[PDB]
Design a protein around this nucleic acid. Structure first.
Ligand code: NA
Length: 497
RNA sequence: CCCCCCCCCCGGGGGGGGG
RNA sequence: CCCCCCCCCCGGGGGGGGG
């Protein structure tokens, strides 16, 4: 038996209804399968519930050849009568599109505008699905390779819709994953059991417990008390107490798309001025923030696309609007500015201490003659929308295709949404973005993505602060631990020595 | 229902090459 | 230890033929 301790923050049996760029769902990574997986810095489509695929010459039609003999979980709440087929695929994508499921808000898919990408998803055979596209999109299968594109049971959802019970789908799960849900208690624990009739090499550990109960501080406490074999997201100050010399535990870090940033509200006539935006950035000592907030578990970010992305062809050039308080003091002190800085009051994966950082920003800006008034704001209060002049947020993405993170944050389409906190719209940026998905080749795709990044770094719609590392601590008995920038953790590979 | 071919998938074992 | 080829075995699913 194995115990995985993590935060109760962001816990869901459905990453589809979850707010985008906030999590990597460790639970749905085990109980649900996608059609494909992408677990390499080359973005190779690993076949999962789809054995293979082919794209039409015009690029507007994708055909998916689904795996045979795949069965859904046999749980106390559901007992399947048939194998996985085209019907389960058709239901799952049509739900997120907003198309007919034929039964008695998806933040990620809304921000990437899936229904504007997909025309239709239809079953040709029980083991063949046809995807119609409005125009060629080289990002489609990468989005269907993401944590958000899990496949649900059509047989289960038909039975549930028969009694208005479709809410159960997210309370009592049924998937094809290597692990199965046994029992749980919300925000406390999840009890997983190995799926015996799995379509691939079976899970090595029969029983896994996902512990959500303990706080960030007492997580390493529970670990060293040996009631916890893998400890995820530990307290940042506690990391500097740990070592790589120990023969009883080891640490594993990973880089990826885990960005903390500051956005300018472009609904504020002052914030629409490039002069002040470039000066506010020059007033910020982002180097000093990395030590006080992250204690060497982060990189000062002068990029939007991580270096682990196939789209990173730029070797992160010097930032033109980096810390220089003298230039900042001149342009701002004489302007006599007072700005409302909002901070989302929640646990952030890209921010251990968001309010502490908001004080360091309030301090750095006062030196150059800018008055900052920080406000603790809730996620639904912001959704309701003195309005903010600056907001402190970020993005955590496993999908390293910049269509999945740069489009939600800076596109015109998402301007009046929670994803684009800058309320920015640049038709030249949307131009590069659109071009980057009409071309199928990496050379062509990375060129347009670097062009858009270069534009973002000069227009300054956001100030990138940190390149955050996701950390975990594991016991020496535990082998089969592989932390990747592409997703959460695969519990199938875990085993004791 | 049994026996035999072809195709795809999965798992295991063995030999060759690359980091 | 990971990734990839070749060979053999096993199991499952699908299509063709014989009793
Ligand atoms: Na918005």
């Amino acid at each position: 038996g194995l115990t995985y301790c993590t935060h109760a923050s962001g816990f869901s049996f459905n990453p589809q209804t979850a707010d985008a760029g906030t999590s990597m769902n460790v639970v749905t990574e085990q109980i649900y399968n996608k059609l494909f997986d992408i677990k390499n810095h080359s973005a190779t489509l690993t076949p999962m519930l789809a054995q293979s695929y082919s794209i039409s010459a015009d690029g507007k039609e994708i055909l998916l050849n689904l795996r045979h003999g795949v069965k859904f979980h046999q749980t106390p709440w559901f007992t399947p009568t048939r194998d996985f087929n085209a019907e389960d695929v058709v239901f799952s994508i049509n739900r997120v599109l907003g198309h007919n499921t034929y039964l008695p808000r998806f933040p990620y898919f809304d921000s990437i505008k899936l229904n504007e990408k997909i025309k239709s998803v239809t079953a040709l055979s029980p083991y063949q699905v046809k995807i119609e596209l409005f125009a060629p999109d080289s990002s489609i299968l990468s989005h269907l390779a993401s944590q958000y594109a899990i496949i649900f049971s059509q047989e289960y959802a038909y039975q549930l819709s028969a009694d208005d019970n479709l809410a159960q789908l997210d309370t009592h799960p049924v998937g094809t994953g290597p692990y199965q849900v046994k029992d749980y208690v919300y925000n406390q624990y999840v009890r997983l059991v190995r799926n015996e009739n799995y379509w691939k090499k079976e899970a090595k550990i029969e029983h896994i417990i996902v512990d959500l109960s303990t706080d960030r501080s007492g997580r390493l406490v529970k670990f060293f008390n040996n009631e916890c074999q893998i400890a995820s997201y530990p307290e940042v100050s506690q990391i500097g107490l740990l070592k790589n010399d120990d023969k009883h535990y080891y640490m594993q870090s990973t880089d990826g798309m885990n960005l903390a940033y500051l956005a300018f509200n472009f609904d504020k006539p002052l914030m629409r001025d490039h002069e002040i935006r470039a000066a506010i950035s020059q007033s910020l000592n982002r180097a000093r923030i990395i030590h006080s907030i992250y204690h060497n578990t982060a990189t000062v970010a002068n990029n939007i696309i991580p270096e682990v992305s196939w789209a990173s062809t730029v070797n992160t050039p010097e930032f033109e609007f980096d810390y220089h308080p003298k230039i900042a003091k001149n342009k701002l002190a004489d302007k006599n500015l007072l700005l409302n800085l909002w901070v989302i009051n929640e646990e952030q994966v890209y921010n251990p201490a968001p309010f502490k950082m908001a004080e360091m920003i309030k301090w750095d800006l006062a030196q150059a003659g800018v008055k900052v008034k920080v406000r603790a704001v809730t996620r639904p209060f912001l959704t309701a929308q003195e309005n903010y002049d600056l907001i402190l947020s970020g993005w955590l993405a496993g999908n390293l295709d910049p269509d999945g993170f740069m489009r939600p944050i800076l596109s015109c389409g998402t301007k009046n949404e929670l994803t684009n906190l800058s309320n920015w719209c640049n038709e030249e940026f949307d131009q590069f973005m659109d071009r980057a998905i009409t071309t199928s080749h990496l050379s062509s795709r990375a060129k347009a993505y670097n062009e858009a990044q270069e534009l973002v770094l000069r227009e300054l719609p956001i100030i990138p602060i940190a390149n955050v590392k996701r950390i975990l601590v594991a016991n020496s008995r535990v082998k089969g631990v592989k932390m990747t920038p592409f997703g959460s953790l695969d519990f199938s590979t875990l085993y004791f020595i």
